[PDB]
Structure formats: C-alpha cells, structure tokens
C-alpha cells in the first residue's frame, strides 16, 4: 500500500548539493592553498582533530558562481534548516577526498590513530585478496571492482572517521554585505516550531555537568566468527546485542557468543548545560525560564558557569513527555546540540597575539597617559573622584602571585572597601566593574548569603553523583566579587569573607562537605557608617563599625564621603544633567575607551611579572618605618586610625607591581612606589575636608 | 613480524627489548635526564627480592624514558598497559630464571616454576585529575594525587565458579572469562544427559578480594571554575587495606569506563558511561 508512506517532493535536491560541496571544499581560494585541503592535510598530518565550517565562505563562493552566471542552488537557506542531514553527509565528501598521511605513523601519537589505521589497512587487504581470488576463478575494473565491494563487508567510513565536524553561522555583517540566518534569540522567543533549524541563543550558562564519555557505537567481539559486530547507539539507552548477528553464524547451527570491547567502542565527549534567559530580555512580570543544551566532542569545555555566551547550534526534539498520564500524545522534549561558541566577556587565559589585537593595544598606548586615560575611562558616567577609579584598574591587574618554591603562597591580589555616605554612588561603580570584569559577580547583604557564599551540595540532575555547587566566591574565581550593603551582612558571612581576603581558600567541615576550596577572588566592598553619614565627633574606629582585624585585610579603604560646597557641586550638576539630556559623555578633548579593548589591554598586562630594584627596595623600607613610627607613636589620638602593618607594606609592593604592569614594564621603579603611597594616604585626606 | 590487533606491540620484540634494558641499566637518567658510583641498578633489586618472597616489582617508569633503547616502550605501557604488563609478567619470570641457570643454586626452582611475578608502574607524568581525562584517555595509565574520604567493605568477586549436579555424582568447575560464567546446560553429557538440571553452589567457588575507595582529588593546578571531585576507584587483592581515610596519596592505575544498569528489573544500560580508576600502584 504505497498510499501508506505517501510520496511527496520538495524543491531540495541533495543528490546535487553534494556535487556542490565536492567543489567548495577544493574550489575556494578567497582565503597551503585551497585552504580546506591544506586543513585536511593537517588532519593527514594528524595535528588537529576538529573541522570548523563557516557560512562566510559559502556565500562568497556562490558569488563567484552567480556573477559568472553559474547556478548557486543555495546551500545556506537549506543548511539553516535540517542541519543533522548535512552534518552527516557534508562529512562524507571529506572522507572521499582528503590528502594522504605524511608524518608516518609513530609511537608518540594518540592511541586512537593506530586503531583506525589498522582497520583502514585491513579494509584494503580484503579487497586485494577477494579480487585476486575472483580473477583466479576461471574468469574490467568497473565491472570487477563493484563485485568485490558488494561481496565484501567492511568497516564503515563513519567508524573510520578521524575527526569531529562542526558549523558556525555567518554574522550579520555578511548578511547585510551582499544583503536572517542568526538572530540571537531569547529562550522565550524560540516559539517551538524552529525545531530542526540552526539557531543562535544567548543567556547565562547557570549550570553544567562534568564531561564524561557517552557511547555512539558499541563494538562487539565474536571469537567463533572473528567478525566484529558494531551496534549504533542513538537514544539514551541500549540493550546488549548478545545474540551474535554475524554473517558467518547466521547460516550456521551454533550462534556463538560475543563480548563488548570498551576501546573499539566509538565514544564522544558529552557535556550539557542550562542557559537561563538573559534577564533584561524577559518581559514585564515574567520569569527567566531555562533551556537544555547538549554538547559533543572537541567543543566540550568551552562552556563554564556564570558566563554569558552566544551559542550557535541545531535545535532538536528528544523523546520525553512527562509520566504517561500527564500526556496528550507524541509530545517531545527539546534540546540544542551545540556547534560553535563565542562569549561576550572573554577568558583571560587565551590572549595570544595576532594581526588584529596588537594594533588594538598599540593604538591605545600611543596617545600616552594610559593609566589616567583608563581610570577616567572606567565608569565615566559618574563624576570625578579619579583616585578611586584609578585604584579599580589596579584591582583588575592585581599585581603578582608569589610562590616561595618552598611550600608558601602569598596573595597576588587586591582587596578594597568603598566606605562612605549616601549620594556618592557606590553600586554603580560596583556594577560597572562587574561588567568590565570577566567572571565578575555582584552580591548583597542578606538572605541566601550563607550558602550563597559557600559550597552547597547537590544531587546532579543528569547523572548519579553529588556535586558541590559554588556560591559567589566560587562562582567567581580569578576575578572580582562585589559586595554591597556590606555591614548588613552577619558573622556567618564575615567569617567566610575574612578568610578569603587573607588567603585564596575556604574550608568547610559540616555534613557531607569536608573539602578545602580554592577562592582566588578579589573582594571589592561598599559599606556605610553606623549613621549612614559620618559623624565628625567620632573617631574612625568608632565611626566605622567593622573590626580592625578584618579592616587590615583591606589593602585600601576609601573614606569616600561628601561635604556640600558652592563650586564643586555645580560641575557635578552639569555632568548629570548633560548625561541625562542624552546618553553621551562630556565634550572633553578625550574619548572614554571602549571596554572590550581595555579588557584586551588588561589581559596583556596580566602577563607581566615585574621585579623590584634595590633602589626602591631600600626606599620602601624607610618609608614604611616612618609610616609605622608615625602611625604608632603619634597617631593614636583623635582622627587617628589603625596601625601600620607588614600587610600594608605588601600592599604597597602589590600596588607598585600593578603600576609597573600597567606600564608594561619588566621592572619596578622608584617612580612607582611614590605613587602607590599617595593612593594609600589620599584615601583618608578626604576626612579633613 | 607479529602484531596485536588494534595495537603497535610485538611480543618478542618487546620481550628482548625489556631484557636488554633489564640486564643493562645504571642510573643513566642522572647522566642524561637533566642537569643532575652505582652499577647493575635493577639486578641488585631482583636478587634482593627472591630471598624475601616479596613478589612485587615496583618500577620507576622514568628509568625507561631516559634510557637509550626503551623510549620505544614508555609510550606503549602508558597506552596499552593491560597488554604490556601482561608481557612483563612473563619476561620477568624468564629473567628470574636466567639468574638461576647462571648460578649454582639451591632449589629456588621448585616454586618459581609455578609462582607469579607482577609489575607496579607508578612514576608517571602529571595530569589535571578527572577533568583532563577526555575519552581518548580511556584505558591508559594515569596517576592521581589526593586523599581518601571513605572505603567500602571487601567485596567477593568470582574467579572460579563451581557447578553441582542434582544427579549422577559429577560436579563441574569453569574459570571466568572476561566477566561471564558460561554455565553448561548439558549435564556433561558423556556421564549422562539431563537437559537443564544442574546447580551452582556459592560456597564451593573461589573468590578474589575486591575493595572500593572514594578519593578526594586535588590537582597541582585546577582551572578557575572548578570544585572538588569525589572520584570512586577500585583496588584488588594485595592492595586491600593498603590505604584508608585521611591518607594523602599518589595513586596510579588505569582509567576506565563502565555502564550502569538503569534498574534492578531489566538489562537496559545507561549510555552515559560511568568512570573510575583500576588501581595498579599506590605510593
Ligand atoms: N557623582 C555622581 N555622578 C553621577 N551620578 C551620580 C553621582 N552620585 C550619585 N549619582 C546617581 O545616584 C545613584 C547612586 O546611588 P548610590 O549612592 O550608589 O546608592 P548607595 O547609597 O547604596 O550608594 C546613581 O543612580 C547615580 O546615577
Ligand atoms: Zn560471530
Ligand atoms: Zn546429572
């Protein structure tokens, strides 16, 4: 009954789009030589493992056809649909045309690349013997060679597949140039019926699983045959094909047993994550709902929690429906199979220099005064006070981590408080540094903050294990944690914080948790005195509520407090009314730097590891003793605060390192510490106004 | 030329190459390895072992890396350990016997003919714990630095199964092959046949000791973002009650994967495999 499975047809014709691909992979020189062939030589060199295909080239390839009057038969409008077909057929061409191996097979190589080599060799010997036996049996290539191919049975090319293939879309630039394909959609905006399409979505990667192997093919061994049995695994589950299906046992009485091989079984690296909606894209009154993303292969570690990404990939059903009764038939779950990733705040750990990034650093330097240029370029939407914002740049670059080579470590990081009264904005600076910091995080005084500053423990949804889930100080690391309403925290919060400023680690010893945990965070804090504003009749140790032991772990505190004045408040009222009249910042003979290029500059400065001259070494000491002698012997009355400490000497060193790194300089001058000491003292000269 | 399937290993060529090393090594790492008296460096430690009965040969793997003629092997035992250590079990016995026959000796022969010798290779390179162990690393030598949080009871695991026959006064035994007990339906027919009537008797069988240990793993570096992992690992006989809660350890073994049964009802297996270490050495 051919009225069942009724025949239909559509404008596509895959049987000649494959004929298009087999030209594109070799017929492209708009950017060694036909680069895909040379890239496949590096696969034939066995020095890379993943193939990235960009629509940027396919479009300009069709222009080289269309402007020559040659039919396009568009791949791009097809490929944004149905990519699970192309991604398993576009790869077939590459098996059928790739260069031969050049660096000959050797012991220092990854073990999978000989297992595949042996089967690929065995494949050809089977043809070589069967052809000769057929020829020898008492009697043309295209005639004979097809007999060999059909009578033989062989390893399939997907099981000899050396590599994983992925796609990336074309950016809007290439869509408007030559005049769709990838709007970065909201998780709400996805409207369901995009199933099948290649889509771009952006949002917070809240939670990830660990990477583990998940099988795609099971290989089974049969002794009595010697033939392998391969089972493709497609769903979440499989049943062992224990009954031997072999071509030698099928027409045989005995049906002898088989055993799985746990290295001949082709795996893939499997990882998955939630993306929650990006909050500013949520409608009024609605909630940031979540979507499930599945990952395969080489891409797997590109997603890390607490970061914002574009994910590009193919959006697909999964067979699940609820629990039988809560059903209305043929429902599906859905997931996104990730293909390529880009992330709007980048990882510092990748920073190498190439033809476009060095000039973005160099054009920033050559105007000079870089340190003051960047301080004013931090948060230029709030008035003046440069000394605070100038120190926030040092908080980012952070100084130098020191390991003693003898079992000791001392913090290469800056911890700061922004004490003051209302009206001189705080959270705006906290929020501004959360954006400019990759891995930046924002926090608040009360509620969840016990667990929120701590490891939870969680039964991991996708797989049967417990995991520690990181609070803010662990969701952030190697980056800034921002604290607000600070003194409205509580002892259980402080005694977590107080350890983290002192050293890079946290320790827990309640219930199922006994670990020692790496923090590696910079704490930048906003706090208010006991009465919101200061009282001049109260000495700072009484005006401030914080205990001086914790305060001594702030390497700088800023007494950033307001006093009314006839002139100074006028220029502020100009800046606020100007920036409220329109978005733009003042018409100074200046430009506030774009943050992403400043992030690149910082990521280069972070690579610098400066050394202190003996000239400054002996100067830092003598300044310290005069500071410490003054601080103790004179300053323990009236407006006097605290005490000078070894820790504040190390603060001056770390700040002096930071300045030298902002110079991009391999050594630390006497000119640096005479600036660092100024920021230390100036933060409280405000108090005399 | 002979070769193992899927593999780069020639038995006899590795056999002679290991002997050539075993009968000629003298701290060449101090000479060669980096910018850093003795002689016969292993022969003293082999002729040490034979009177003590300590059947274990603890091996500093980096002896081979520096040495001139077994760079060809370091990257094999690292990558094919289940098979390459199965070679070493044989070569060392033959290399013990060469120290018999060159000696006027008492009757060491009457047991070392039958007894078995093994290798524990530990001195291998560093790794980022569980995390860098992508599936390309399945079934390879590995090491971990860390500590123990708990250890299970000792588990009985089958090594010879026993069969009792409900009639006719003959039993049967079968050795386990790669995780199966192929129980004969036929009553060992040549005595007589009854189609299906035979038993399996628990308390006659021969068992391994097995033990499982939970390791809190602590790498020399961890990426920004990470949190501690509780790996689960397994240890066999002669290592049971070697190490226990609170010990700080370097351990080495084979990284593995295994399925899990979804439920106690039916043989459906989860496709997202579980992973563990089979311990071969603990320092
Ligand atoms: N000096 C300034 N320049 C520009 N805007 C300011 C300034 N001071 C305050 N503001 C405005 O006031 C708000 C700051 O509130 P803020 O004082 O940070 O709350 P808190 O009392 O918690 O610190 C911001 O919205 C900002 O626009
Ligand atoms: Zn078979
Ligand atoms: Zn019987």
**Does B136 lie in the same domain as B254?**
yes
Gap from CA of B159 to ligand 3 centroid (Å)? 24
Phi, psi of A263 (to 5 degrees): -120, -30
A-proximal residues of B, 37-76, CB under 8 Å: 72, 75-76
- Tally the domains of chain B: 2
- Nearest to residue A289, comparing CAs of A277, A278, A271? A277
Q: Which residues contact A678 (CB under 8 A, 6 or more apart)?
A: none
Exposure string over A625-647, b if 16+ CB within 10 A, otherwise e:
eebbeebeeebeeeeebbebeee
Partners of A303 on chain B (C-beta within 8 Å) are: none
Report, in this order, helix, strand and coil percent for chain A, each rounded to 5. 35, 20, 45
Q: What is the 3-state secondary structure of B81-118?
A: HHHHHHHHHHHHHHHHHHHHHCCCCCCCHHHHCCCCCE
Resolution of the experimentally solved model in angstroms = 3.8
* A423 assigned binding-site residue: yes
In the numeric block, which tokens belong to residue A141? 């290539």
d(CA A12, CA B133): 43
**Does B263 lie in the same domain as B197?**
yes
With an 8 Å Cβ cutoff, are B260 and A235 in contact? no
**Does B283 lie in the same domain as B149?**
yes
Partners of A518 on chain B (C-beta within 8 Å) are: 222, 226
**Does B56 lie in the same domain as B74?**
yes
**Does B140 lie in the same domain as B97?**
no
Tell how strand A611-612 and strand A556-557 pair up.
unpaired
Gap from CA of A642 to ligand 3 centroid (Å)? 93
Residue B125 contacts A where some CB pair is shorter than 8 Å:
no
- Nearest to residue B174, comparing CAs of B195, B204, B147, B194? B204
**Does B258 lie in the same domain as B138?**
yes
Q: What is the 3-state secondary structure of A599-667?
A: HHHHHHHCCCCCEECHHHHHHHHHHHHHHHHHHHHHCCCCCCCCCCCHHHHHHHHHHHHHHHHHCCCCE
Domain end point (choices B79, B94, B126): B126
Contact call for residues B84 and B134 (beta carbons, < 8 A): no
Contact call for residues A661 and A676 (beta carbons, < 8 A): no
* A510 assigned binding-site residue: no
Q: Which residues contact A235 (CB under 8 A, 6 or more apart)?
A: A319, B271
Residue ranges lining ligand 1, Cβ < 6 Å? A 382-383, 422-428, 572, 576
d(CA B214, CA B130): 13
SS3 label, residue A432: helix
Chain-centroid distance of CA A75 in Å reads 30
Q: Quote the DSSP letter at residue A585.
A: P
Gap from CA of B189 to ligand 3 centroid (Å)? 8
Partners of B274 on chain A (C-beta within 8 Å) are: 212
Positive/negative CA dihedral, A43, A47, A52, A57: negative
Atom 4, ligand 1: residue with shortest CA distance = A382
Q: Quote the DSSP letter at residue A56.
A: H
Query: In A74-111, where does DSSP find H-type helix?
Result: 76-79, 83-86, 90-96
Q: Which residues contact B19 (CB under 8 A, 6 or more apart)?
A: B91, B94, B95
**Does B238 lie in the same domain as B160?**
yes
Domain end point (choices B98, B126, B154): B126
Residue A213 contacts B where some CB pair is shorter than 8 Å:
yes
Show the beta-strand stretches assigned E in chain B.
Answer: 56-59, 118-121, 141-151, 155-164, 172-175, 199-200, 206-217, 229-236, 248-258, 269-270, 274-282
B134, closest residue in chain A (CA to CA): A269
Q: Quote the DSSP letter at residue B272.
A: B
Residue B79 contacts A where some CB pair is shorter than 8 Å:
yes
Of A107, A213, A236, the CB nearest to B275: A213
B-proximal residues of A, 284-303, CB under 8 Å: 300
Ligand nearest to the CA of B164: 3
**Does B199 lie in the same domain as B253?**
yes
d(CA A473, CA A379): 24
Count interface pairs A-B at CB distance under 8 A: 111
In the numeric block, which tokens belong to residue B31? 């000479």
Method of determination?
cryo-EM
Atom 18, ligand 1: residue with shortest CA distance = A425
| Interface with B, mutate which of A105, A106, A112, A215 (most B CBs under 10 A) | A215
d(CA A344, CA A644): 42
Q: Which residues contact B198 (CB under 8 A, 6 or more apart)?
A: B163, B164, B165, B166, B172, B183, B184, B185, B187
Atom 13, ligand 1: residue with shortest CA distance = A425
* A274 assigned binding-site residue: no
Partners of A211 on chain B (C-beta within 8 Å) are: 131, 134
Residue B268 contacts A where some CB pair is shorter than 8 Å:
yes
With an 8 Å Cβ cutoff, are B227 and A467 in contact? yes
d(CA B139, CA A239): 23
Angle, helix B81-101 to helix B43-52, in steps of 10 degrees: 80
Partners of B267 on chain A (C-beta within 8 Å) are: 239-240
Tell me the residue range of the domain where A480 lies.
356-688
Residues in the 5 Å CB sphere of ion ligand 3:
B 165, 167-168, 187
d(CA A482, CA A417): 10
Q: Quote the DSSP letter at residue A504.
A: S
d(CA A606, CA A523): 18
Domain end point (choices B78, B96, B126): B126
Chain-centroid distance of CA B185 in Å reads 33
Gap from CA of B193 to ligand 3 centroid (Å)? 6
**Does B214 lie in the same domain as B86?**
no
What is the CATH number for A432? 3.40.50.300
**Does B155 lie in the same domain as B111?**
no
Test site for ligand 1: of A376, A419, A423, most ligand atoms within 8 A of the Cβ: A423
A12: exposed, middle or buried (Cβ count in 10 Å: 0-12, 13-18, 19+): middle
* A638 assigned binding-site residue: no
Residue B176, min C-alpha distance to chain A (Å): 13
Residue A425 contacts B where some CB pair is shorter than 8 Å:
no
Of B76, B130, B262, the CB nearest to A107: B76
Residue A467 contacts B where some CB pair is shorter than 8 Å:
yes
Gap from CA of A151 to ligand 2 centroid (Å)? 18
**Does B97 lie in the same domain as B53?**
yes
With an 8 Å Cβ cutoff, are B268 and A112 in contact? no
Of A214, A257, A305, the CB nearest to B272: A214
**Does B132 lie in the same domain as B176?**
yes
What atom in ligand 1 is closest to the CA of residue A576? Answer: 4
* A425 assigned binding-site residue: yes
Residue B52, min C-alpha distance to chain A (Å): 37
Tell me the residue range of the domain where B112 lies.
1-126
Contact call for residues A515 and B228 (beta carbons, < 8 A): yes
Contact call for residues A297 and A269 (beta carbons, < 8 A): yes
Show the beta-strand stretches assigned E in A59-208.
Answer: 164-168, 184-185, 198-208
Q: Which residues contact B64 (CB under 8 A, 6 or more apart)?
A: B21, B70, B71, B73, B74
* A427 assigned binding-site residue: yes
Q: Which residue has the tokens 């894209």?
A: A281
Exposure string over A479-507, b if 16+ CB within 10 A, otherwise e:
bbbbbbbbbebeeebbebbebbbeebebe
């Amino acid at each position: 009954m051919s009225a069942a499975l009724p025949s239909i047809q559509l404008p596509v014709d895959y049987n000649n789009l494959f004929n298009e691909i087999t030209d594109f992979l070799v017929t492209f020189k708009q950017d060694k030589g036909p680069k895909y062939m040379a890239m496949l030589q590096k696969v034939a060199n066995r020095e890379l493992n993943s193939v990235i295909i960009d629509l940027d080239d396919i479009l300009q390839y069709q222009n080289e056809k269309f402007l020559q009057g040659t039919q396009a038969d568009d791949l791009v409008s097809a490929i944004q649909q149905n990519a699970n077909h192309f991604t398993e057929l576009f790869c077939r061409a590459i098996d059928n045309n790739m260069p031969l191996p050049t660096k000959e097979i050797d012991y220092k190589d990854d073990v999978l690349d000989v297992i595949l080599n042996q089967r690929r060799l065995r494949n050809e010997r089977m043809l070589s013997d069967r052809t000769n036996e057929i020829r020898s049996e008492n009697l043309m290539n295209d005639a004979l060679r097809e007999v060999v191919e059909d009578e033989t049975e062989l390893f399939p090319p997907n099981l000899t597949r050396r590599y994983f293939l992925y796609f990336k879309p074309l950016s809007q630039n290439c869509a408007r140039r030559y005049r769709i394909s990838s709007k970065p959609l909201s998780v709400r905006q996805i409207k369901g019926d995009f199933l099948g399409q290649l889509i771009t979505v952006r949002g917070i990667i809240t939670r990830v699983s660990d990477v583990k192997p998940a099988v795609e093919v099971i290989a089974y061994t049969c002794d009595q045959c010697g033939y392998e049995v391969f089972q493709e695994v497609n769903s979440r589950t499989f049943t062992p094909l224990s009954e031997c299906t072999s071509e030698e046992c099928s027409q045989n009485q005995t049906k002898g047993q088989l055993f799985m091989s746990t290295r001949a079984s082709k795996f893939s690296a499997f990882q998955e994550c939630k993306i929650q909606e990006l909050s500013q894209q949520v409608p009024v009154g609605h909630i940031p709902r979540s979507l499930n993303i599945h990952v395969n292969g080489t891409l797997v570690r590109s997603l890390s929690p607490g970061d914002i990404v574009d994910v590009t990939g193919i959006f697909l059903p999964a067979p699940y429906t609820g629990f039988k009764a809560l059903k209305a038939g043929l429902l599906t779950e859905t997931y996104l199979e990730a293909q390529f990733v880009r992330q709007h705040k980048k990882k510092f750990a990748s920073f190498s220099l190439t033809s476009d990034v060095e000039e973005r650093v160099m054009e920033l330097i050559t105007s000079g005064d870089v340190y003051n240029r960047l301080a004013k370029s931090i948060a230029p939407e709030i008035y003046g006070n440069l000394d605070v914002k100038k120190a926030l740049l040092l908080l980012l670059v952070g100084g130098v981590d020191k390991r003693v080579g003898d079992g000791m470590k001392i913090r290469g990081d800056i911890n700061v408080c922004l004490m003051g009264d209302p009206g001189v904005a705080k959270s705006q600076l906290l929020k501004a540094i959360c954006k400019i910091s990759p891995r930046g995080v924002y926090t608040t005084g009360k509620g969840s903050s016990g667990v929120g500053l701590t490891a939870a423990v969680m039964k991991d949804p996708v797989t049967d294990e417990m995991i520690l889930e990181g609070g803010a100080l662990v969701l952030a690391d190697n980056g800034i944690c921002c604290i607000d309403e600070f003194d409205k925290m509580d002892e259980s919060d402080r005694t977590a914080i107080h350890e983290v400023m002192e050293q890079q680690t946290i320790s827990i010893s309640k219930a199922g948790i006994n670990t020692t945990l790496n923090a590696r965070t910079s704490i930048l804090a906003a706090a208010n005195p006991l009465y919101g504003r200061y009282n001049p009749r109260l000495s700072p140790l009484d005006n401030i509520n914080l205990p001086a032991a914790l305060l001594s772990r702030f390497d700088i505190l800023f007494l950033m407090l307001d006093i009314p004045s006839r002139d100074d408040d006028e220029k502020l009222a100009e800046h606020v009314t100007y920036v409220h009249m329109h978005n733009k910042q003042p018409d100074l003979d200046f430009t506030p730097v774009e943050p992403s290029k400043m992030r690149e500059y910082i990521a280069y400065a972070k690579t610098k590891r400066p050394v202190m001259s003996e000239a400054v070494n002996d100067y830092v000491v003598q300044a310290y003793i005069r500071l410490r002698q003054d601080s103790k012997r004179e300053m323990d009355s009236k407006f006097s605060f605290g005490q000078a400490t070894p820790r504040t000497l190390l603060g001056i060193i770390r700040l002096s390192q930071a300045l030298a790194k902002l110079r991009l300089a391999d050594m630390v001058d006497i000119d640096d510490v005479e600036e660092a000491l100024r920021l230390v003292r100036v933060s409280k000269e405000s108090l005399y106004q | 030329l002979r070769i193992i399937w899927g593999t780069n290993v020639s038995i006899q060529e590795c056999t002679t190459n290991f002997r050539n090393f075993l009968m000629s090594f003298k701290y060449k790492f101090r000479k060669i390895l980096d910018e850093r008296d003795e002689e016969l460096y292993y022969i003293k430690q082999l002729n040490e072992m034979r009177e003590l009965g300590t059947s274990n040969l603890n091996l500093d793997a980096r002896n081979l890396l520096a040495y001139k003629q077994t760079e060809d092997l370091y990257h094999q035992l690292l990558n094919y350990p289940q098979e390459v250590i199965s070679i070493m079990d044989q070569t060392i016995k033959d290399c013990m016997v060469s120290l018999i026959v060159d000696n006027n000796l008492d009757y060491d022969l009457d047991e070392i003919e039958t007894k078995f010798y093994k290798v524990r290779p530990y001195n291998v390179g560093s790794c980022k714990g569980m995390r860098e162990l992508n599936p390309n690393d399945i079934d390879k030598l590995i090491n971990l630095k860390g500590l123990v949080l708990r250890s299970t009871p000792v588990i009985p695991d089958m090594k010879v199964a026993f069969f009792k026959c409900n009639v006719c006064d003959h039993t049967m035994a079968v050795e386990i092959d790669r995780g199966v007990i192929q129980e004969p339906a036929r009553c060992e027919r040549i005595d007589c046949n009854e189609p299906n009537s035979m038993s399996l008797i628990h308390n006659r069988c021969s068992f391994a000791d097995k033990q499982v240990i939970k390791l809190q793993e602590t790498p020399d570096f961890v990426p920004d973002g990470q949190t501690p992992h509780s790996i689960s690992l397994c240890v066999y006989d002669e290592l049971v009650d070697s190490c226990r809660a609170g010990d700080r350890i370097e351990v080495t073994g084979t990284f593995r994967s295994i399925p899990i049964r979804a439920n106690s009802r039916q043989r459906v297996l989860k496709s997202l495999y579980k992973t563990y270490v089979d311990v071969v050495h603990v320092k």
